[PDB]
């Protein structure tokens, strides 16, 4: 049905087994009879053939497939496949393996968005392990790898080339969202709203601080929009705060990037207001305290929260009632600023 | 001074380049003349020649180094160097590139702890991109890759314990695919002063188990079953961490979201934590006046999301332990507060 995989050695095998674990249907071509053999032994069925033959690709279902995984090792063959596919199967999304930088560059120029250098992440992981056995903590080693990865990709993208409302959205599952999605649909029908969805930008929890601080600089209203999770916020939003509100950008000497900007907490909850009469300091507004303190410390003005309660039990029309009041609040804020 | 890298091609150059940024001092063995100029550019000492030569290895400082990175591509050569080092330089920690699962298994059998299959994490990123373009969210896709990584490593670990033929391995593949607990969540445990002393104290008691989340899950891929198993044995659960923006570390929040599952911790039914106790043990830079901020001021208010979480899951919330003033702290206050932490734990178990 949806995926063709060209090459089913070390690289292709892993990519295909991940997709199988998600119940994705695929057809696999390999031109190595020994690899096909070893795979038969482990219950994987792979078809024999050179994937640069458009007749083979065509019978594998290329005209109807969504994604082709180019996992061929040889740069020139890998590149031939790429060019042939975009000429004969232009609807087909190409995801490609790259042997090295030279190969990655040729793939970028061919129009592949994100070529994966075959040894890059493994070599990065090896570096982390070496740092660890030298005594760095595992987490700090991983942050250093994240910093190097961002620098190296930017460098390599450059080589390839050479040849106001800011909503910080922090739903972990934006595609599964009912309440927050409706809120965003409504907020989009204003100008000039920018939305930064953290879990789409940073699935590996590697905040790009410079990019985030740049967006915040162009914002007059910042919004923390998220579903409530355990009387609190999602892990990535907490990470965003800890990293982006840096010394001395958000606080200290000096430190004043956020001064005079406003902040709004826009939160959705499963339970209704009565669900929060628990513990030593009951009530919904008490839950804002860490966030409000955070904002005030960094020189932000804290607006009264937008809270959409009772998303568990409802009419599927307060989902749009309360969603419109969200837009109302944003529009209100800006007609005054 | 500290690191030897054997092989400086695509794999060795990335690894060595990461280490430069960390100011690590290294020496490199490599037998390709096309890399000599790249090594010179970085100012790195190179021994040109076959890295399996005992003389080059000795010249490179093998007897003195802490770490050897085996970034040789050819599996036999890689394995040869590994055995050489295991035999003659037993102090030397080996980090090894593995070509594939067969090479990985043989390195494991040779005593290498975590060989890194060279294409594995990259093939996993490619699979994630495939899933995204088929409509999965990036994050949900990353989580699927975490589940797959965990099971894959477990599977390959069991294949390593059996004989080196495909039939023996394919058989294993087919069969397999068919009391105080301190939850410590400082992101930088080695840089800790206050929490480190707290743990130094707590470790003098028994039976205390410590799970350092940032040592265990630097990639924020929580093993829910392992965490739930450890909780099953605990009578007192401690969330121990430094305060970060009036709240908790991101990884502790992920641990709650993931480990307090439906219905293990709440729902039907849903009662695994019922009857257990919870202590919040937190450290703060500021003193009590530091919390005179916002509409609901005062340190105590801040325990609210934690207390409500605990109550909801049927845990028994204890008065928090807090160590304030770490910003400007007499080591006698730090010594004194660490001891009081131990005191509090001891008094809980004398009571239970
Ligand atoms: O590194 P690797 O282990 O991932 O091997 C690359 C794989 O790609 C396959 N391959 C190379 N060229 C191919 C082509 N033209 N068509 C189909 N498969 C090909 C090889 O047979 C090999 O199995
Ligand atoms: O894939 P790769 O690009 O990472 O290259 C492997 C590297 O290891 C080096 N290498 C292979 N065998 C070696 C040996 N025996 N001694 C020193 N260097 C070696 C090669 O020169 C090559 O640079
Ligand atoms: C991990 C988890 C923890 C949650 N904790 C709370 C809670 O503390 N209080 C609450 O009212 N809702 C809680 N919820 C429910 C969500 O807030 C609710 O489903 C969400 O706001 C719905 O918005 P959505 O349609 O955009 O997903 C939790 C949900 C999950 C996934
Ligand atoms: C990102 C970050 C946020 C912090 N937020 C607070 C805070 O809200 N209140 C406070 O008193 N200290 C805060 N601190 C200080 C730490 O709580 C304090 O340095 C830590 O508890 C010291 O313990 P340690 O020696 O174990 O690292 C913060 C520190 C960092 C790194
Ligand atoms: Mg392949
Ligand atoms: Zn999603
Ligand atoms: Zn550390």
Author numbering:
A (entry chain A): 400 to 562, 1001 to 1174
B (entry chain B): 400 to 577, 1001 to 1174
What's the publication's text?
In this report, we present the structure of the KTN-bearing C-terminal domain of E. coli KefC (KefC-CTD) in complex with KefF, resolved to 2.4 Å resolution. In order to stabilize the KefC-CTD/KefF complex for structural analysis, fusion of the two domains via a flexible 12-residue synthetic linker was pursued. Crystals contain one dimer of the fusion complex within the asymmetric unit. Although all of the residues of KefF could be constructed from the resulting electron density maps, much of the C-terminal peripheral domain of KefC-CTD, as well as all of the artificial linker, are disordered. The structure reveals that KefF binds to the ends of the hinge-forming arms of KefC's KTN domain, fixing this hinge at approximately 120°. Unexpectedly, the structure reveals that KefF has a novel zinc binding site not found in the other quinone reductase enzymes with which it shares homology. The metal cation is bound primarily by three KefF residues: H12, H13, and Q37. Further, this zinc forms part of the extensive interface between the two subunits of the Kef system, being also coordinated by a backbone amide group belonging to G536 of KefC. The cofactor for this protein was determined to be FMN by mass spectroscopy, a conclusion that is consistent with the observed electron density in the structure. A binding pocket for GSH between this arm and the rest of the KTN domain suggests that the arm can either be stabilized in the obstructive conformation by a smaller GSH molecule or possibly destabilized by bulkier GSH adducts, modifying in turn the protein interaction interface's potential ability to associate with parts of the membrane domain, which might lead to activation of K+ efflux.
